[PDB]
Design an enzyme around this catalytic site. Structure first.
Site, PDB file in Angstrom:
ATOM      1  N   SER A   1       0.804  -1.212   0.000  1.00 33.12           N
ATOM      2  CA  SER A   1       0.000   0.000   0.000  1.00 33.12           C
ATOM      3  C   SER A   1       0.834   1.257   0.000  1.00 33.12           C
ATOM      4  O   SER A   1       2.070   1.215   0.079  1.00 33.12           O
ATOM      5  CB  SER A   1      -0.948   0.002   1.199  1.00 33.12           C
ATOM      6  OG  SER A   1      -0.232   0.089   2.412  1.00 33.12           O
TER       7      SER A   1
ATOM      8  N   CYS B   1      10.031   1.399   2.886  1.00 29.75           N
ATOM      9  CA  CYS B   1       8.844   2.218   3.086  1.00 29.75           C
ATOM     10  C   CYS B   1       7.974   1.699   4.199  1.00 29.75           C
ATOM     11  O   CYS B   1       6.974   2.306   4.506  1.00 29.75           O
ATOM     12  CB  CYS B   1       7.968   2.240   1.834  1.00 29.75           C
ATOM     13  SG  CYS B   1       8.846   2.725   0.352  1.00 29.75           S
TER      14      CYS B   1
ATOM     15  N   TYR C   1       7.721   8.136  17.157  1.00 32.50           N
ATOM     16  CA  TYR C   1       7.834   8.282  15.710  1.00 32.50           C
ATOM     17  C   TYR C   1       9.078   9.104  15.368  1.00 32.50           C
ATOM     18  O   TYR C   1       9.827   8.733  14.478  1.00 32.50           O
ATOM     19  CB  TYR C   1       6.556   8.939  15.126  1.00 32.50           C
ATOM     20  CG  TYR C   1       6.471   8.892  13.613  1.00 32.50           C
ATOM     21  CD1 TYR C   1       6.590   7.706  12.936  1.00 32.50           C
ATOM     22  CD2 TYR C   1       6.251  10.052  12.869  1.00 32.50           C
ATOM     23  CE1 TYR C   1       6.523   7.653  11.553  1.00 32.50           C
ATOM     24  CE2 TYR C   1       6.177  10.017  11.481  1.00 32.50           C
ATOM     25  CZ  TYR C   1       6.319   8.810  10.829  1.00 32.50           C
ATOM     26  OH  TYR C   1       6.253   8.749   9.446  1.00 32.50           O
TER      27      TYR C   1
ATOM     28  N   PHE D   1       1.418  12.860   3.226  1.00 31.55           N
ATOM     29  CA  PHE D   1       1.008  12.168   1.999  1.00 31.55           C
ATOM     30  C   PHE D   1      -0.334  11.440   2.140  1.00 31.55           C
ATOM     31  O   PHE D   1      -0.760  11.080   3.255  1.00 31.55           O
ATOM     32  CB  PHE D   1       2.100  11.195   1.566  1.00 31.55           C
ATOM     33  CG  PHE D   1       3.206  11.848   0.780  1.00 31.55           C
ATOM     34  CD1 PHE D   1       4.134  12.667   1.402  1.00 31.55           C
ATOM     35  CD2 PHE D   1       3.317  11.667  -0.603  1.00 31.55           C
ATOM     36  CE1 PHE D   1       5.135  13.276   0.683  1.00 31.55           C
ATOM     37  CE2 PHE D   1       4.321  12.289  -1.331  1.00 31.55           C
ATOM     38  CZ  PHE D   1       5.230  13.089  -0.698  1.00 31.55           C
TER      39      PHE D   1
ATOM     40  N   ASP E   1       8.017  -9.997   7.769  1.00 34.89           N
ATOM     41  CA  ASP E   1       8.144  -9.126   8.908  1.00 34.89           C
ATOM     42  C   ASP E   1       9.547  -8.541   8.835  1.00 34.89           C
ATOM     43  O   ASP E   1      10.526  -9.190   9.192  1.00 34.89           O
ATOM     44  CB  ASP E   1       7.935  -9.892  10.223  1.00 34.89           C
ATOM     45  CG  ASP E   1       8.134  -9.004  11.467  1.00 34.89           C
ATOM     46  OD1 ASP E   1       8.528  -7.827  11.314  1.00 34.89           O
ATOM     47  OD2 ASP E   1       7.922  -9.476  12.599  1.00 34.89           O
ATOM     48  N   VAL E   2       9.642  -7.289   8.392  1.00 30.59           N
ATOM     49  CA  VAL E   2      10.960  -6.603   8.235  1.00 30.59           C
ATOM     50  C   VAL E   2      11.854  -6.571   9.458  1.00 30.59           C
ATOM     51  O   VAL E   2      13.060  -6.495   9.326  1.00 30.59           O
ATOM     52  CB  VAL E   2      10.866  -5.159   7.732  1.00 30.59           C
ATOM     53  CG1 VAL E   2      10.275  -5.144   6.340  1.00 30.59           C
ATOM     54  CG2 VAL E   2      10.027  -4.331   8.660  1.00 30.59           C
TER      55      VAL E   2
ATOM     56  N   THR F   1      -1.793   8.593   2.489  1.00 26.46           N
ATOM     57  CA  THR F   1      -1.550   7.206   2.893  1.00 26.46           C
ATOM     58  C   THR F   1      -2.897   6.578   3.183  1.00 26.46           C
ATOM     59  O   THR F   1      -3.894   7.291   3.264  1.00 26.46           O
ATOM     60  CB  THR F   1      -0.734   7.135   4.201  1.00 26.46           C
ATOM     61  OG1 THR F   1      -1.433   7.826   5.235  1.00 26.46           O
ATOM     62  CG2 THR F   1       0.689   7.767   4.024  1.00 26.46           C
TER      63      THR F   1
END
Lengths: 260, 259, 249, 260
Positions: free
Chosen positions: B19, B90, B165, B198, B63-64, B200
């Site tokens: 996405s 991303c 974040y 953005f 899973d990064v 999203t």
């Protein structure tokens, strides 16, 4: 003392990594300026010895900065001992070097994670809990209830080969300063960050002398290792100067670290 | 253009590809003649993307933040397309949580989780992609690969509630230089993009008056950024060999207020 | 095809300073070849004429001292007269001298500091203010956009070496203007961006991590093109430098 | 005070814009800490009155900081009065607002040029001449021969609509700090920059009180105008702390200026 000058006497400091290096020097500075200190360190021997040497104005509480439960216990112990918390200084940290692509393969994920845990998560954990305690204080001079000081590193700006983990953790500390300051402004709690260059730390004193002297000569001026008491003098100034907030201050003799 | 780096036939590995930003990067890459391996934790979205993009696309559930999933993702890309030329990180979460909230202090678990996905995850895919890229033969100008990470304007102008974040994205931004410095020896460039606001999935979930209000906070263009614009910048970074070790703000001159 | 918010370079009118050589020449070339019009500005007539001649009917040249109010205005007028509008300004005119604060003969000359500032910073501001004024008269185009201004700073704005007080001061000044100017000109749909180049051509490359070479002017021009095409780029300074961080010495 | 702490007593300060605001408060702080001051200002009435009020440890010399000949005369007058120069503090500055595209036309070129002349060229002029004098001093503590402190602004980072000139000039000051510090390191001269937020300056005190109070309420914490004595306290800490070099410090209560 002039009108907006913030007094250091009788303020209660909570300090991490306080058994050695930067934290030890902050604890010494604070006690000698007339303040109370609660020393936090994972090493009991070093922490007990420090608190012992500093005297009645000092206490020690064994603490893993990255632990929720230890963090609480540290807060509770500070309150029980001295009734309040006015200043937090986060100096606990590790500075390992490990290449992304090393002789024996890729950087271990575990070592990256661990550096982040101690340097960044640990800092956030003590910060969130200190803040919560500080917000209960009555508003003091200029409405101020507390000051939080974190330690980043010039590695947040000039990361060398092998410092991905270290730069990531310290860049993270640096970048939190503003959002945290912005919120805690409502409660009169300031948030600042110091980014030290090369200082006489325990890791540093572990190196052979020729290597120590060579690091010192890499610093434009003064061409020497920084003294922990100079980091402590800056901490003092941040506590005393109320207009300092939401900022990262390089303490580094104009050093800009080369790649190698 | 003599030193222009060609995008055709290069192999992209892309995280969060089911996405938003990662989807748009995947689309751009396939349509410019490249191969893409899509990575996402959500199988439904990832499969559908790879299906829609066609023969030049594959999907691998990932899973990064996992060592073993990371390796499997590399192996799958090699098995499918023989090499990896570009990594684009991303995958990310953007939660808001106050330091001092209704239910007490910020939870440690939530902070830790945001760091795990955004930062540890980015580092994990980076380390493993780099290792694969180093096996490539040196190409144009000696280049073997390009790694592009995604930070955020939160790395600079963090708002109330963005400690986690900002910490995670500031960490990403600050890695760029030490990583670029080391990987230079292998001809692997390392760049970071710091997006503003953005369109999203979380964004498109919001009611329209709120979307429009976010857009009107951006000086110019006074709108939400389009994921294809983020993808256009990723393309330029792949094409322009002088771009290295830098963080680029893509944000319409936005400087986020505290609240 | 090409994405909905992609900004087309075809038919846009570029005004370019220092256009007779180096970076500005390469931007002029890129622009003409992508289907745009260019007005070349340079203090050197020989170089500027020769460039405009080689680029053809889509190029003009106008002799210009960027620091001059009257030359600046004449340059705007000449662009309007030739091509009816101005869509993009690219400031590439600059000098990069080295002079120590304390030199063998004495202190850094005040005149030399002032002159570096005049050409690099005042000159950039002068062309910017006048281009902006002209761009504001355009009809709002795609996404409401009326123009793009691109300035050239330098990695000296961040990693200034011994001897670069003047150069760093001037380029730091350019970098710091980007935001307040972008903030105002946002009302008119004019974007404002800045590129901070590393070491570019004109073993000398071996100080640059990767690619370990001198940058090519066409690579600087490619980045300019991308800025004009990508509408979400605004109010930002972009380092184009192969990860270079200049040492002191 | 610790071994590497730099003493302020008996050091000779040269200070620009010293008749008012930030420079007046630096002069006051310096005299009261036992130092000598030479005040420089274009306004004779204000400068004389300051030097008069501060007493025997103060002198005044009328000066256009952007002039080569005035700059030299100032140096000569400081040497003649106190034999040496140890610290330069550049506080002379103008902070105009003017739009790029205004109601009555483009930003004037003359006004832009003038802001640059006073803020940036003026700061460079005093710096180059003070450095030349400082280099003649014998190396003191830690080999140090001088400290130069410049004043930028948060406008160097968060420039508002109407601040192109001001941002350009102050961004220029900030960016010089490193290349100058790098060179002057060889002579033991440190070079630092302070970036103030909103302070009670004469321009500020010229505004109506409701507008003052509103500017103050834009600052996260402390939500007020900064006091010039706080800027002076940070100057003092820079002169005292030898590890501070080649850095820009934001003094701004965590302010991040909006566009408007």
């Amino acid at each position: 003392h002039h009108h907006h000058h913030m007094q250091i006497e009788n303020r209660v400091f909570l300090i991490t990594g306080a058994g050695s290096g930067l934290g030890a020097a902050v604890s010494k500075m604070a006690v000698e300026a007339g303040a109370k200190v609660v020393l936090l360190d994972v090493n009991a021997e070093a922490g007990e010895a420090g608190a012992k040497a500093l005297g009645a104005s000092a206490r020690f509480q064994r603490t893993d900065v990255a632990s929720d439960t230890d963090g609480k216990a540290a807060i509770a112990a500070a309150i029980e001992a001295f009734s309040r918390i006015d200043v937090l200084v986060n100096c606990a940290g590790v500075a390992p070097g490990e290449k992304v692509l090393g002789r024996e393969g890729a950087h271990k994920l575990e070592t990256f994670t661990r550096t982040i845990s101690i340097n960044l998560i640990g800092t956030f954990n003590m910060l969130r809990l200190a803040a919560e305690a500080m917000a209960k204080n009555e508003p003091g001079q200029g409405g101020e209830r507390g000051v939080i000081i974190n330690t980043a590193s010039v590695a947040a700006f000039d990361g060398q080969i092998g410092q991905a983990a270290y730069s990531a953790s310290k860049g993270g500390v640096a970048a939190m300063t503003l959002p945290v300051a912005r919120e805690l402004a409502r409660h009169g709690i300031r948030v600042m960050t110091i980014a030290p260059g090369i200082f006489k730390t325990p890791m540093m004193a572990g190196m052979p002398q020729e290597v120590q002297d060579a690091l010192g000569a890499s610093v434009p001026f003064p061409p020497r290792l920084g003294e922990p008491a100079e980091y402590a003098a800056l901490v003092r100034h941040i506590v005393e100067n109320q207009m300092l907030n939401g900022e990262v201050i390089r303490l580094d003799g104009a050093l800009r670290m080369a790649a190698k």
